Design a protein around this ligand. Structure first.
Ligand SMILES: [Zn+2]
Ligand SMILES: [Zn+2]
Ligand SMILES: [Zn+2]
Ligand SMILES: [Zn+2]
Lengths: 65, 45, 56, 46, 234, 49, 33, 79
RNA sequence: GAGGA
């Protein structure tokens, strides 16, 4: 659901990069290759963690109660 | 006046709920195996 | 065989009634106890036999 | 407030004795939720 | 079943069903070793009983009644099923009596007229039969439920229905010709609520729907307008 | 130390199937028995043997 | 005119409440789009 | 101190730091809940301990949870 | 129904 913290293997914190990642995509139109590299996710153990996340918690947030 | 709706109602329901395509009196002679329980284990499933 | 199997024994006249343990009574609800299938069959045999005695 | 049940549909509050089992009095619903406890449940961070 | 060792007259024992034993929770001795788990037409005078059963069942179908009401009526019929105090009574009067028995016992509101529309009982022999049957069952051993049925039959919302509920609740304490066959009181409370509202269900439709008097409603409404004082919740 | 052989290495999609073991582990040490045959009951959920 | 029986309805069949509803409603119905 | 060394009944200020968290969806839009919303309660005794690390340039740390409107989250933690 | 293997 929500971003995981701490790339599973690598351990690096990634739970904060999510917002900025989305921002780069929308406002900067950036390409997610370069987007990731901008956030510093060098090794793919973390790049995977971000790039492939799926943010279901959005669709959870739409049930009224 | 005096039409047994319960006939159709219950007949349809029972048949669906068990899947014995036949009659509620038909236990085994009724064809079965239709109407399973919608495996919802994983969206793709 | 003479002692154990004489052909007339191949047709029943008296009938043995297996005791409850062969046909135990499941109490699958707690006020009433669904009787064993055989017991129904026995009730049926007994009913019919009663009826035949009556009709005779 | 302290709570005893929640209407499922109206998502408000409610209280009931062994009386009725239904009727979110406003919506008159028929399904109620059991109004999460207050035991300050403990959790293990792992 | 007692502990030979501990020997307390009310034996504090436990059943360790998972082990299938029974233990003297005091001394620990096991008492019983293997615990059997169990968890998973004319020759019988039930000929008339089953005829009643079948007619009762088809009637229950027609009424769309709950299986609990069906069972209650079947049980009531089985409870009487024969008596001099019954003495015949057409075997349909008793059906209708036991049906109303089942509905009342399972808290289902049913009109004698609805039951008679189900079954030709002439309604007077039905009255006598239900009286005698009630008395028999009393030997053998709460009018609010009617409101929402008619609210539905007229297509009325739930806040309207609860307004009617509170009105009928005050009806008992508002003698000043409160009830005297309070079906009229229920219907006039409904009329009060609709007139409080702006619903085009004017008396004609409600009367022809519920088979009620077009005049007893206004007869009640006469005292109802005076009674209006004790009916404003919000 | 380095390994003498290099390693194939990369991400790959893996799906966790059901039936964790905690639903298979099962052990009976004289528990309850049936009615008909007085043999041990069946099914681990029912403490079977 | 005359009542008879009662038919089960396939979900989102033309006769189902959901058959045409939109997303936001679906959410309000607590029913996953 | 390691908790298994502090004799206090499971925690104290020599072996633990108590954090706490309250969030409420006051807004109409989604209310994010960031690590930075954590607040120390226990006394640090002047030990540079327990401020959630904020490498984020925007200043709010890890994204803990999201809140819609009425959803309220309120808990306390022990470090 | 389920069903793993
Ligand atoms: Zn990593
Ligand atoms: Zn409600
Ligand atoms: Zn003992
Ligand atoms: Zn301590």
């Amino acid at each position: 659901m929500i971003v995981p913290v701490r790339c599973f293997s690598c351990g690096k914190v990634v739970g904060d990069k999510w917002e900025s990642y989305l921002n780069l995509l929308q406002e900067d139109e950036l390409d997610e290759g370069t987007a990731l590299s901008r956030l510093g996710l060098k090794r793919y153990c973390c790049r995977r963690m971000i790039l492939t996340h799926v943010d279901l918690i959005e669709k959870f947030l739409r049930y009224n109660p | 006046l005096a039409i047994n709706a319960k006939t159709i109602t219950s007949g349809l329901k029972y048949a669906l709920a068990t899947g014995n395509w036949g009659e509620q009196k038909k236990a085994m002679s009724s064809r079965a195996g239709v109407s399973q329980v919608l495996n919802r284990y994983t969206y793709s499933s | 065989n003479e002692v154990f199997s004489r052909p007339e024994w191949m047709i029943l006249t008296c009938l043995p009634v297996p005791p409850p343990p062969v046909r135990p009574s499941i109490s699958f609800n707690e006020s009433q106890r669904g009787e064993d299938d055989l017991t129904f069959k026995l009730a049926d045999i007994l009913k019919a036999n009663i009826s035949l005695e009556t009709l005779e | 407030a302290t709570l005893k049940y929640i209407c499922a549909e109206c998502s408000s509050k409610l209280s009931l004795s062994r009386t009725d089992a239904v009727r979110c009095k406003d919506c008159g619903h028929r399904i109620l939720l059991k109004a999460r406890t207050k035991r300050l449940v403990q959790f293990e961070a792992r | 079943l007692t502990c030979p060792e501990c020997k307390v007259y009310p034996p504090k024992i436990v059943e360790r069903f998972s082990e299938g034993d029974v233990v003297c929770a005091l001394c620990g001795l096991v008492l019983s070793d293997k615990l059997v788990d169990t968890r998973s037409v004319m020759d019988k005078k039930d000929n008339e009983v089953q005829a009643a059963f079948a007619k009762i069942t088809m009637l229950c179908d027609a009424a769309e009644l709950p299986k609990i009401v069906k069972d209650c009526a079947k049980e009531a019929y089985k409870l009487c099923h024969d008596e001099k105090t019954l003495k015949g009574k057409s075997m349909e009067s008793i059906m209708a009596a036991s049906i109303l028995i089942g509905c009342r016992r399972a808290e289902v509101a049913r009109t004698f007229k609805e039951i008679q529309s189900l079954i030709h009982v002439k309604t007077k022999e039905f009255g006598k039969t239900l009286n005698i049957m009630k008395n028999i069952l009393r030997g053998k051993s709460q009018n609010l439920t009617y409101i929402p049925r008619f609210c539905s039959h007229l297509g009325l919302p739930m806040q309207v229905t609860t307004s009617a509920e509170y009105t009928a609740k005050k009806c008992k304490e508002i003698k000043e010709i409160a009830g005297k066959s309070p079906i009229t009181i229920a219907v006039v409370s409904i009329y009060l609520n609709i007139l409080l509202f702006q619903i085009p269900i004017t008396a004609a439709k409600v009367g022809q729907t519920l088979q009620v008097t077009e005049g007893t409603i206004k007869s009640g409404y006469k005292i109802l307008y005076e009674h209006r004082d004790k009916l404003v919740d919000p | 130390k380095k390994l003498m052989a290099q390693i194939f290495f990369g991400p790959t999609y893996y799906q966790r199937l059901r039936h964790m073991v905690d639903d298979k582990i099962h052990a009976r040490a004289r528990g309850p028995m049936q009615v008909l045959t007085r043999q041990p009951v069946e099914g681990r959920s029912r403490d079977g043997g | 005119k005359v009542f008879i029986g009662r038919l089960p309805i396939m979900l989102r069949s033309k006769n189902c409440y959901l058959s045409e509803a939109t997303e936001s409603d679906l959410y309000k119905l607590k029913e996953c789009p | 101190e390691y908790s298994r060394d502090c004799f206090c009944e499971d925690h104290c200020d020599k072996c633990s730091v108590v954090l706490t968290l309250q969030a409420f969806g006051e807004s109409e839009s989604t209310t994010n809940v960031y690590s930075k919303d954590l607040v120390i309660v226990s006394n640090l005794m002047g030990r540079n301990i327990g401020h959630p690390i904020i490498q984020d340039k925007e200043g709010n740390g890890v994204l803990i949870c999201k809140l819609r409107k009425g959803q309220e989250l309120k808990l306390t933690c022990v470090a």
